[PDB]
Amino acid sequence: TQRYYVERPIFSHPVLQERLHKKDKISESIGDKLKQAFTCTPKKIRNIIYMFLPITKWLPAYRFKEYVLGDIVSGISTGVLQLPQGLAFAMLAAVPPVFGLYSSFYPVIMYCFFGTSRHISIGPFAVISLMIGGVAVRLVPDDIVIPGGVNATNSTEARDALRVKVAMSVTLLTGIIQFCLGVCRFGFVAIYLTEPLVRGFTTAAAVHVFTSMLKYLFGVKTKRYSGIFSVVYSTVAVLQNVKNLNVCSLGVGLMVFGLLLGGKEFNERFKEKLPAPIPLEFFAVVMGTGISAGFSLHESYNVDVVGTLPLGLLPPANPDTSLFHLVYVDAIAIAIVGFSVTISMAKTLANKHGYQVDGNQELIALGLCNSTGSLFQTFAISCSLSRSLVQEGTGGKTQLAGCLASLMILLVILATGFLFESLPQAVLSAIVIVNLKGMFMQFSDLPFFWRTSKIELTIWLTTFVSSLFLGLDYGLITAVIIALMTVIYRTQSPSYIVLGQLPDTDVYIDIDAYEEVKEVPGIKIFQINAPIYYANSDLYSSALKRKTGVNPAFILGARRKAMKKYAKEVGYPPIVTKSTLPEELQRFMPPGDNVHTIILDFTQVNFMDSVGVKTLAGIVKEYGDVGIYVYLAGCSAQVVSDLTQNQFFENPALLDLLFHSIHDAVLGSQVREALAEQ
Amino acid sequence: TQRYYVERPIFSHPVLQERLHKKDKISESIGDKLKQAFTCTPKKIRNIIYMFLPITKWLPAYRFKEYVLGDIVSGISTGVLQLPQGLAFAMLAAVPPVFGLYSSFYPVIMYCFFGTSRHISIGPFAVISLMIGGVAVRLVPDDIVIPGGVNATNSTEARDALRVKVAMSVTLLTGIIQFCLGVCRFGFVAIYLTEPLVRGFTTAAAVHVFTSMLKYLFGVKTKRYSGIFSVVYSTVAVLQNVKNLNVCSLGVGLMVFGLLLGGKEFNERFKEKLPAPIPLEFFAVVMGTGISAGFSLHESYNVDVVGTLPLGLLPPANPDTSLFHLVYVDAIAIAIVGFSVTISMAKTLANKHGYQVDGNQELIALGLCNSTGSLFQTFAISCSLSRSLVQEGTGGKTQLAGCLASLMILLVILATGFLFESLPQAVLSAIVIVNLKGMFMQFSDLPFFWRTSKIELTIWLTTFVSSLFLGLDYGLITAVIIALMTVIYRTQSPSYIVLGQLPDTDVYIDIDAYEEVKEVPGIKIFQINAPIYYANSDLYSSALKRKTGVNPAFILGARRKAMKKYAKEVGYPPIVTKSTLPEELQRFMPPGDNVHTIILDFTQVNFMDSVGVKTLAGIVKEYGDVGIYVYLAGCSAQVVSDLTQNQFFENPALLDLLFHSIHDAVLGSQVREALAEQ
């Protein structure tokens, strides 16, 4: 009770206004830096070169004597992990693996040339390109290509080249739109994608891909289906075709999968410093190819296989404007959605170390990567998670050996072509399924958010379900829409609370939560913790009337009833704001409360609008007509301006209805009542 | 300086917490009123009957000796005005006028049976039904109907019946969806449509209809065009076809229009009590028909005409489910959009007198009206503005003679059929163009909003332009989307202001606006007037760092530079929140400011989320690591809960970082500094 002594005069609005003067702070050419920019200063040019090219400044900063070795081992490990994942994803998107290797190779060096993140991976998604191949199959049948005179019995390479072409088209579209959007300084557009939304989205995608690799584990072939409920159709078709599968395929897949989990668990039991990360994928692939060569795991057992690798560089084939118009006409939505996923994933992965990274810069860098790749016969690209978890778990922070991993895979795409034609698909399916562990453990958020709140759980469940059932593009877009809608909903249902003054103090708290605060007689206090705009005004008015229990409508009606019942015989603009009491000391007083002023707390109201101003004017006019005073709380500049600009401050007297604190309003009302005693 | 004496102990968080206890207030069966509802009490049943049927209670309340006469004259005037408008709109939507009369007649009595507003009109729009007829023309050509063996040369009645059928279908759809949506207690969905949006939308519609009636003034026929840029095509086609028009048609139209404006202006110059409202439409129609009969204003002059009226009652033809599926498959969007326009217009017109009106109730009442009409071969319905402006300007508040106006038009639709076959279209076009005066004067909002703000002008212009160029449905839907987006945008760009304490007081105001307040040395204050959620957190962090000028990144970097430069020779979980000073009294102090605590004002933060909590934790951890204290402002229950539920309140010490006022935080920090002096 020692400190916090105030003893202050009562500032309503005008007193504090007169206590102060104004400033200017403003010059000419506001925002018009062009008249002061545009010089040949070396500083601006060199800085522009710096921020469009970071490797210039990455050049010196490189440590040694263990930093080099850690970097190199990191790059080697990440490349050897990237390889089989590239193969698997290329097989996923229904393309010969050589183009998956092209994707694994070219954008890596492109990014190393352009990119500020110290950690990176390439090609974590093929499902959207899958849906694109589905649309292309919907365009041309899988067996009716050209009935000409080539005298080919049944070759499926033509449709495959078709799918490659459509992938090139969509990826060029994506890269170009990415350059276009990045150059406009939209490092902010990524912000609209929230953590729970991304979590649920990625989990749904993991489910989709697991369902897809189920069949390539089973060996039993099946026509692929895309579109709405695509997972449903594919799953039920596979379960129908369980009859007549390959038992040896399932056996080898299960054996290798179990061995891989056993190795990973055994390594994880001895996770010490001396044990360095071991590339399980490399052992998996070498043993798979060795066993395939040993026991003749091919047409000898009639099991599936990789097939011949077109070992050799391909010059960049020109994308000819023949049907690019028509194809992007219906590829636009898919391009932009797969886009938004990629950019969001990349940027959220960027914020790992306490380091600053430019947004639009990385956008443009990836745009160059994408356009160049698609011109080099390459599909879409982004950064896969676990790969940086390697670069970081390896301890290699720099990206040098990371991009050197591309030169490392260069030998495979240049030297070893016979080494890889013989290999099944179940092995790759096992690889990806094992990789899916973290995404499948992402489910922990359900009880956590359940205990946490309702809104974030709602968004997570809705985006997950929509992405699962419907296509990925539709799921994402509806998720974003509802994400922006939840904010409106939250501002639709605020917490209307009536205050109660803590005794002999100036703090005001809700009454019905503590059974220790009491309310000052004859006054009422009403607080809304949400801005007042068009969609939220009438709720506020009605809630106020029904919560203060002072609804003037029935008050007036009961007054009329009482007066007519007591009635048994004959016995510049001077606009008054608050009417005097219409009562003439009758004896038919409607039992209830006697409140003489109402206090509207505005400490939470961030902004207003025309509709809010109209509603406030209505409230003021109504209560003054009844004969009840009202006051506001908080002479903030924004709200003062909002009232002023709108047709409110004609100052009949309304400037005399402001306060800069709740307590000031309380004291002022009490003083007015006291002065009323003549 | 007399009043407002406080002398209060310093409540941070825990002190005020211990000062109070809690309550319960909660029983079982929360929200489960079903166990206490569901009885045979006459009260609930009678009230339900009351709120599903108001005319029961309208029955007694009816005044006399001038109230009857005013009501009757109001009803007669409104009917005689409704008639020609009904004719014009029916001609607008490309339908024989008899069905326009059906629309003018049946829903009126339906509404009188079901509806609580004392003022009403019917059938203010036909443009959406026009676009529907456009789609139907897009379905079947205007001249290729059935090449059979009927031996009819060229009759256009078949396509007209087709358009009537499609109108019936869409209107049944609308009525049924209206019942469906109203029964679910959505009196709130109308709230999303704001005043400026509706203003711009209605103005755009007025422009469209004026463009449409241009040709029917010109007499020069033209194939009608709908869709995107529809106004553009129709306008340019008419201006191309200006050659070979009918001069007599234009002459009579201009003469009658000028005479009508002259009469209206002359009446408005003598707007006194004794002059009662005169129905200008009635004089217009009678003189038009008289002159048409006199000088043979028909095929004698080859000018246009109304044509024969199918005088007679039509039994309700059954809507057969033959192509209803296919037609609503692409009529859904148009139905729902024309819907939303109608409901919004009706409800906003309801709030005229200080009276309460139920929303979902009126929704269901209009749904019955619409379904019954569409079953009786009737198109869509709503309330036109000026008509109630008549009912009110006439002074007739009750709706009795208003619905009796339907019985008044009954004579025309039953007795006078020869009286109206002979009449041109330019007269009706003049009627509607004259009616458009208020909608065309709605343009005044442009400079008003220009001086007012930017957001509402933005929304008004955008909705107006989109409705003009594109179709009405597209314009409306994009307007609603951007309307909900502007709120997000407003929360994206708050007003970051740094406070300055008013001397020897406890009020804190922005420094750089008044050049009279000063800041307390060693402290800094930061206020955001917007909630902190996912889409708005990083903006807040970065703005804070760059505005307080205390960005710890460069502070740490400069500290490292200074230390290495001064370096020239060798000479339960105890988690500390704020680190001590890492400085060891060097001499290379980076020149700048010395601030020892930061104050985050939360009096505006309405709510938070997971991302906001993470960002706050990051800020706290960072600044404590640097060695800078921080504090919050406002121990509100909502924000306290938000921090608590999220992984924040493990109370290492964080409960000791709260305050219920800015001044409390200031004093507490000063006390901590003072106590630091040992």
Side-chain angles (χ1 to χ4, degrees), chain B residues 297-577 579-607:
Chain B
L297 294 174
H298 45 81
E299 66 271 12
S300 170
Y301 269 86
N302 298 115
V303 309
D304 196 80
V305 75
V306 169
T308 295
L309 283 72
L311 188 71
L313 165 62
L314 294 175
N318 59 6
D320 187 69
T321 66
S322 60
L323 298 182
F324 290 171
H325 204 56
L326 172 62
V327 300
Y328 74 74
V329 160
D330 63 358
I332 58 171
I334 298 89
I336 67 174
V337 175
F339 200 73
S340 301
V341 176
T342 61
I343 188 64
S344 175
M345 187 66 204
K347 272 318 206 154
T348 183
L349 288 185
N351 294 131
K352 257 50 176 179
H353 166 65
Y355 200 76
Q356 71 286 5
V357 64
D358 185 3
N360 63 7
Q361 188 275 331
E362 293 290 332
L363 198 40
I364 289 303
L366 183 63
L368 288 197
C369 295
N370 188 359
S371 63
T372 293
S374 189
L375 182 145
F376 270 33
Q377 316 150 353
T378 296
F379 43 90
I381 52 182
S382 179
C383 178
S384 181
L385 23 114
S386 33
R387 323 203 125 277
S388 51
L389 262 338
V390 171
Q391 241 203 259
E392 198 36 67
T394 48
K397 297 191 86 68
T398 52
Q399 64 285 330
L400 301 153
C403 76
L404 298 188
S406 64
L407 266 164
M408 183 278 288
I409 68 169
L410 187 153
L411 62 83
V412 182
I413 62 170
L414 192 58
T416 61
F418 281 107
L419 192 58
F420 294 98
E421 309 189 348
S422 302
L423 190 78
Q425 305 185 6
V427 292
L428 277 296
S429 309
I431 284 174
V432 295
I433 290 301
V434 172
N435 284 121
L436 294 174
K437 187 65 181 174
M439 283 73 74
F440 272 78
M441 271 295 148
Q442 269 191 4
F443 271 92
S444 66
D445 302 338
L446 277 296
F448 171 69
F449 285 155
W450 164 251
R451 289 187 294 102
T452 298
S453 173
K454 298 181 176 70
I455 308 302
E456 74 302 349
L457 187 153
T458 303
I459 191 168
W460 192 107
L461 277 195
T462 300
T463 183
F464 163 74
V465 163
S466 177
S467 172
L468 174 75
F469 283 178
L470 272 70
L472 273 297
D473 58 357
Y474 302 146
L476 187 153
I477 193 66
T478 191
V480 162
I481 301 149
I482 61 171
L484 301 183
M485 181 75 168
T486 58
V487 170
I488 305 313
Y489 157 71
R490 193 170 307 182
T491 64
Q492 291 271 50
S493 65
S495 71
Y496 294 99
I497 57 173
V498 175
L499 277 296
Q501 190 262 9
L502 187 74
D504 63 86
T505 53
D506 65 336
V507 180
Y508 303 79
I509 303 299
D510 170 77
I511 47 173
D512 46 327
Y514 306 97
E515 66 198 18
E516 298 192 17
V517 296
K518 287 82 182 182
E519 72 184 5
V520 184
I523 77 168
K524 276 297 185 61
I525 298 168
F526 193 73
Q527 171 185 5
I528 181 168
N529 47 2
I532 297 169
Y533 57 72
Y534 59 92
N536 178 347
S537 55
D538 187 78
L539 285 71
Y540 167 83
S541 174
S542 63
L544 162 74
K545 295 199 213 271
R546 79 160 178 83
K547 177 170 301 303
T548 42
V550 301
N551 188 356
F554 323 102
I555 306 306
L556 193 73
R559 282 168 285 188
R560 307 291 68 67
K561 289 274 302 308
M563 61 79 71
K564 82 178 187 58
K565 293 297 185 186
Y566 207 104
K568 322 173 201 312
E569 67 282 349
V570 72
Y572 179 78
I575 312 171
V576 187
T577 68
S579 66
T580 186
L581 182 62
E583 168 63 22
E584 54 282 356
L585 303 180
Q586 303 290 98
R587 278 72 201 172
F588 294 162
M589 283 73 74
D593 297 330
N594 182 26
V595 61
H596 45 65
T597 185
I598 309 300
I599 312 305
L600 304 176
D601 166 83
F602 280 1
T603 55
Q604 321 301 329
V605 171
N606 308 133
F607 60 88

Side-chain angles (χ1 to χ4, degrees), chain A residues 631-672:
Chain A
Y631 297 107
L632 311 190
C635 304
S636 66
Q638 166 61 27
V639 184
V640 163
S641 178
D642 263 8
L643 273 297
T644 317
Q645 307 178 227
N646 295 264
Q647 179 62 22
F648 203 89
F649 283 159
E650 305 303 324
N651 190 18
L654 315 176
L655 275 298
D656 292 331
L657 273 73
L658 275 298
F659 288 95
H660 207 78
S661 162
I662 297 174
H663 209 78
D664 285 15
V666 174
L667 300 190
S669 176
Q670 285 162 329
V671 174
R672 181 202 71 217

Side-chain angles (χ1 to χ4, degrees), chain A residues 1-11 17-25 188 191-196 448-449 451-453 456 459 480 482-488 490-492 495 502 504-509 511-516 528-531 533-539 602-611 614 635 637-638 645-647 660-661 663-664 667 671, chain B residues 1-11 17-25 188 191-196 448-449 451-453 456 459 482-488 490-492 495 502 504-509 511-516 528-531 533-539 602-611 614 635 637-638 642 645-647 660-661 663-664 667 671:
Chain A
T1 57
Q2 170 193 348
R3 292 150 185 101
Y4 200 74
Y5 165 83
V6 183
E7 187 67 29
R8 177 183 56 85
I10 296 302
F11 292 163
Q17 291 293 151
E18 80 179 20
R19 192 59 50 86
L20 52 81
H21 302 346
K22 311 295 299 288
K23 314 181 68 173
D24 51 355
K25 186 186 182 183
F188 82 103
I191 203 68
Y192 295 86
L193 306 189
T194 312
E195 181 65 26
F448 171 69
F449 285 155
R451 289 187 294 102
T452 298
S453 173
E456 74 302 349
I459 191 168
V480 162
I482 61 171
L484 301 183
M485 181 75 168
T486 58
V487 170
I488 305 313
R490 193 170 307 182
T491 64
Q492 291 271 50
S495 71
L502 187 74
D504 63 85
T505 53
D506 65 336
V507 180
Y508 303 79
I509 303 299
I511 47 173
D512 45 327
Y514 306 97
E515 66 198 18
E516 298 192 17
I528 181 168
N529 47 2
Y533 58 72
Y534 59 92
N536 178 347
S537 55
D538 187 78
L539 285 71
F602 280 1
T603 55
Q604 321 301 329
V605 171
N606 308 133
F607 60 88
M608 301 195 38
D609 67 330
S610 61
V611 191
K614 264 172 291 303
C635 304
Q638 166 61 27
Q645 307 178 227
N646 295 264
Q647 179 62 22
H660 207 78
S661 162
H663 209 78
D664 285 15
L667 300 190
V671 174
Chain B
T1 57
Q2 170 193 348
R3 292 150 185 101
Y4 200 73
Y5 165 83
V6 182
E7 187 67 29
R8 176 183 56 85
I10 296 302
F11 292 163
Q17 291 293 151
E18 80 179 20
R19 192 59 50 86
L20 52 81
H21 302 346
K22 311 295 299 288
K23 314 181 68 173
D24 51 355
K25 185 186 182 183
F188 82 103
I191 203 68
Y192 295 86
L193 306 189
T194 312
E195 181 65 26
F448 171 69
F449 285 155
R451 289 187 294 102
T452 298
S453 173
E456 74 302 349
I459 191 168
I482 61 171
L484 301 183
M485 181 75 168
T486 58
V487 170
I488 305 313
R490 193 170 307 182
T491 64
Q492 291 271 50
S495 71
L502 187 74
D504 63 86
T505 53
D506 65 336
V507 180
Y508 303 79
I509 303 299
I511 47 173
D512 46 327
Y514 306 97
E515 66 198 18
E516 298 192 17
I528 181 168
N529 47 2
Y533 57 72
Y534 59 92
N536 178 347
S537 55
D538 187 78
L539 285 71
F602 280 1
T603 55
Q604 321 301 329
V605 171
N606 308 133
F607 60 88
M608 301 195 38
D609 67 330
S610 61
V611 191
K614 264 172 291 303
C635 304
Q638 166 61 27
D642 263 8
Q645 307 178 47
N646 295 264
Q647 179 62 22
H660 207 78
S661 162
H663 209 78
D664 285 15
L667 300 190
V671 174

Side-chain angles (χ1 to χ4, degrees), chain A residues 306-317:
Chain A
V306 169
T308 295
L309 283 72
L311 188 71
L313 165 62
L314 294 174

Side-chain angles (χ1 to χ4, degrees), chain A residues 53-118:
Chain A
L53 202 54
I55 48 185
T56 65
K57 301 165 295 303
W58 294 113
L59 169 65
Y62 182 74
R63 311 302 96 194
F64 310 93
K65 277 74 69 177
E66 66 271 16
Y67 200 79
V68 184
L69 196 61
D71 183 73
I72 299 299
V73 69
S74 68
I76 296 313
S77 66
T78 182
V80 75
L81 173 62
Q82 183 44 290
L83 182 62
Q85 191 166 2
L87 278 297
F89 270 96
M91 180 279 259
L92 171 60
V95 162
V98 58
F99 294 98
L101 270 299
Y102 293 154
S103 311
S104 177
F105 174 109
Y106 299 111
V108 173
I109 62 170
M110 295 298 102
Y111 184 60
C112 182
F113 293 10
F114 300 93
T116 59
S117 168
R118 53 183 45 78

